[PDB]
Amino acid sequence: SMYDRHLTIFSPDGNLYQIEYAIKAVKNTNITSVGVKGENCAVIISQKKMATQYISQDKLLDYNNITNIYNITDEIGCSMVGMPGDCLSMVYKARSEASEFLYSNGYNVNAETLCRNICDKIQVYTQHAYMRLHACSGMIIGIDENNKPELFKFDPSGFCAGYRACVIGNKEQESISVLERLLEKRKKKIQQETIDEDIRNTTILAIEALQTILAFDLKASEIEVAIVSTKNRNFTQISEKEIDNYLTYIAER
């Protein structure tokens, strides 16, 4: 009808244009996040950058507070990109879902189940006309009961999937190629690594992937790196000093 693009109703071709518009809104924030998965660890790297919007970046703005990475639980972490209010709303929804799961089932939800429940909540937004769509795309990392790293990604359309390496950003095909090249290079090496070596290599791979995708040198203070691993199952940020060490190592090698 006259509102097939204003509401979440099908267009004559069978499309839902409001979902595509929400995806475009996420894409317009110009925030890039890269998630990588190792043998026993998973890393999420993001930009400590303010999502592009009506307001700009002020000099007196506290740049430590700028973050696109959150703790869903002690052992599950996420990176959310999109409209900041929507991202906060999604983070709170995920936290409440995880807490309800813990209380109801006596054990902690894992990343796959959390992502699937979030997407089940998103489907209602896609199907009901009176609600707006949340312009938020998220990465979630954790460690499952079998001690394997889990990396899942969900988009505004309610689609979730597990990835070996994923990226939210403006351009995704070239980013996918970059991540494929990096992962093939990692797999070419055949000697088994220790847990610490795997952690270090996964973190280096994530940092290098973000540098290649953004095509400019990264400053340790402008990026945020969080990791989860078997050694330390708590989803923890790594310090700016460690990030700078990794960047210097990448530059020097």
Partner: peptide, 8 residues
């Protein structure tokens, strides 16, 4: 729009 930011 619901976006909170910290300043000095």
């Amino acid at each position: 729009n619901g976006a909170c930011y910290k300043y000095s």
